[PDB]
Amino acid sequence: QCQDVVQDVPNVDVQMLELYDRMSFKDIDGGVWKQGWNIKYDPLKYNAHHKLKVFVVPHSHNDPGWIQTFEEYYQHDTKHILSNALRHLHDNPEMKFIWAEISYFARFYHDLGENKKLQMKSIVKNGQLEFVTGGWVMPDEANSHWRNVLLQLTEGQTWLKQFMNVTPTASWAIDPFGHSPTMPYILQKSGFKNMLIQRTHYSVKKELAQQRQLEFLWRQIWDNKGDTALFTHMMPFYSYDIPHTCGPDPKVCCQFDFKRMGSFGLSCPWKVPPRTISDQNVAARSDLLVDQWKKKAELYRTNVLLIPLGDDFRFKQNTEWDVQRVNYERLFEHINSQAHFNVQAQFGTLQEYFDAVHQAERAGQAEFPTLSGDFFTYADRSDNYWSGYYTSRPYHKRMDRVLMHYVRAAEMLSAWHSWDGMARIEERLEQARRELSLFQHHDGITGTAKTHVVVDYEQRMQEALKACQMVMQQSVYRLLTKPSIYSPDFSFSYFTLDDSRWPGSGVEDSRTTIILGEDILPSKHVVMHNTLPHWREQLVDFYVSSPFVSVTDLANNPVEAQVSPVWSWHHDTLTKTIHPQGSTTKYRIIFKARVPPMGLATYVLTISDSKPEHTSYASNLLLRKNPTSLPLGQYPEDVKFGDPREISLRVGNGPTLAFSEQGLLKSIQLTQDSPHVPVHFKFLKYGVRSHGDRSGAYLFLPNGPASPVELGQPVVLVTKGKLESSVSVGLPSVVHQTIMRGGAPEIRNLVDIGSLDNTEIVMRLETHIDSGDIFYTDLNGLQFIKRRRLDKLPLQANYYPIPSGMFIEDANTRLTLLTGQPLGGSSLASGELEIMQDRRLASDDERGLGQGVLDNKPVLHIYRLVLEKVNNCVRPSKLHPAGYLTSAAHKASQSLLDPLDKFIFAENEWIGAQGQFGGDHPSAREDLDVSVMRRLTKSSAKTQRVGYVLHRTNLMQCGTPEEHTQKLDVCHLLPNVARCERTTLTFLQNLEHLDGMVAPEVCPMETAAYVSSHSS
Ligand SMILES: *[C@@H]1O[C@H](CO)[C@@H](O)[C@H](O)[C@H]1NC(C)=O
Ligand SMILES: N[C@@H]1C[C@H](O)[C@H](O)[C@@H]1O
């Protein structure tokens, strides 16, 4: 039976929200362990029959971009680290090394001669070089979507299986800025047995260390039974560098970083340098080091101790390999032979550490606590909370979500067929997956890299978008053209993509107008794709060169349509106002597209000489004092003008929205009867401190609560149509738009912070919902976690990642804000929600980036706003740490992240065109998604294989029958199935051979992967 994820509160030893409520977070000086205490141990704890086993694990943290680009670091540092690791591990059989970032390792290995490839394979096979995690990168855990965490994990592990014949089962995450339970969720479903984390709040490290709870079985917050649990090691100290990994006193541990004696340009800030180990000092040196090790061991439950030995881009020079290796070997020889220490120390790997810990556990020497929750928001010291990077470089955060969807759609659309090598499908998909995967790095999507590195990530993602477009349009042409007519040129553009929300109106004028005319071209085919596994209707829009356009399906049935002007906003330097201009040569046509599950639907746009029967025209009202005319070319309705005033709008039988005279929402009425519920949007600004620590790309250090943006008398544009209405207003730094299509409104903000230095712009919602101190935010687009706003912590500590949505509720009412981009946000008072839009910061914030954030560019942020009655919903109890979306909020999120794709046929006539693809595909319940569909074999494989990742969310029961759907069996989506297997989520291991070749659907909050084999 499926676990109930709502009604049983798991019993765990440590529940992070409960721990937060209880903890006092006092920042006291703990002595040499600044954020701890003076650790004491009983020397008689170890003896001949109970020794301390110490694993020193050499490592090198290699950022795939940060202060230099990926390729710059590869040429300057990483290729030398890997070349010298190969040499020194080969020559020194007891030395060990771990490696995390497969993007760099693949970059290196493919440039090796065969002789060196063979030597590399041998030091991996014999266990000297060990891959940890084996993702393409070490990803951010706050802003990343779980689908892209899995994508990058799969990209790295598929490479490693192919070329190194290994699949890591231990994860190493020493640098992401706070940690998410989405990681153990994905890793445990991908064969992992152990993971390690580091950047958790210094007060959490102290609290868990005092209880010896730094090693725990980390389960998901809803998991009563514990089947999601993954053994997790949290490192105890302030950094992963050598001063903070040997033991609690960095002034002592720095003396054991043998790269700091001077010739390498490094030194010890605690003013005592390392000394070369010799026969004359090894006993004293070992005394000092073993005492640090035994203090660190006090914080953990077994007699097996992990000592990382590394730092950023370490193990580069041959002289550095020698100075670390030779000095540690001298220490190990002395320590291991001096019975009075009762220690056995050696170089080891991460897996070796975890294997020895679990051998101790099985021998009955330790029992580990259970834990649920997350580790946000991180602070490394004092009040320095790392909530700034939840928003930094928001243009690229939004681009991540656009590319996420494009990769999914290109892999799915092209998976239906096998393609000849000449089509370059696999090549373009590999490039797209790798550039998106690279951006999941903890200096990519986080917005914490130097300006020229951000430009490199953007250029890579632009090439990845172009790759996706090529694959998608080739696939649409093949899926919708009569097979005996299909005659592809794999370099040709049969369709171009039309995307209404990226980069966005006002960000780039990149959309193509469909040009129709009696003397050039009467009509145009367009095609919509729906990547979701259920039938979808959704309004779509295109630019057209006439307002007199009508739409038909490919059975020539008329489709109701609305035409609206194309409005653009200009900051007018002559009048010093922000106001809209309408085009006099292009127009927007909007209509409802109905598209099969995982399918395609074709429509035709036809010009006529006059208003067509099934096309209506929106009215337009410009509210401002001092108006001037707004001609619209051939558009048949004249614009109307008026002074600023409150206005109300309703589309279809949907909610009625009321707006202030400044163009901002004031209330929502859900039904014709019901109350006008206050829901007010407001824009505010945070500044930066003029004394003490400055906000930068990582840190948010506001100078108090936000202050309202002074709005003046902004110009408001109201467009009212049968199918779509909107209110748009030109505010300082934001063109804010509320769009209504008959259900939950859509909000679009065109955010241009301009030259406003030391400013963070926030969008706040004010309501009467009696939420108190509780609010909910998501983790990686996968789950919603309960937050409690703690007044004992500063403002910036109450900011959390908002990777896809947030909500507040009381007994009767909920307000959910869904996002199309990860941003930071909070609820700083009962009834409020707020989300940061952009931040422009002049100073560096002392974490090594060496710049502020002064490279802002206009970005179009998108949202959905769902106000709902929830008193009839079956919700978790007050003690449950999770929350769950309603059906309407989940569908609104899907509308933002995986919209219909739109294709415009590029030539004048499409011969052989077909009207639909996928009409026979099952329309699966609403809580189930086909997150990934990917063909895993090239055309030369006799047995083709297609992989699917199926995710089922959990939606609240609120009494809507909402029913009859068809079972989805992904293993029968392609014909001639010969086998169906359940696999790990990376597709790399078969877990179950399935009866009747049927892939079962999954339980709420579960994710499974299946591979179908076809003998076609
Ligand atoms: C891959 O490793 C497995 C595990 O022992 C081994 O049996 C197999 O032969 C290896 N494949 C090769 C040799 O590349
Ligand atoms: N350890 C530092 C943090 C910075 O953001 C970059 O990821 C470096 O590795």
Ligand SMILES: [Zn+2]
């Ligand atoms: Zn890093």
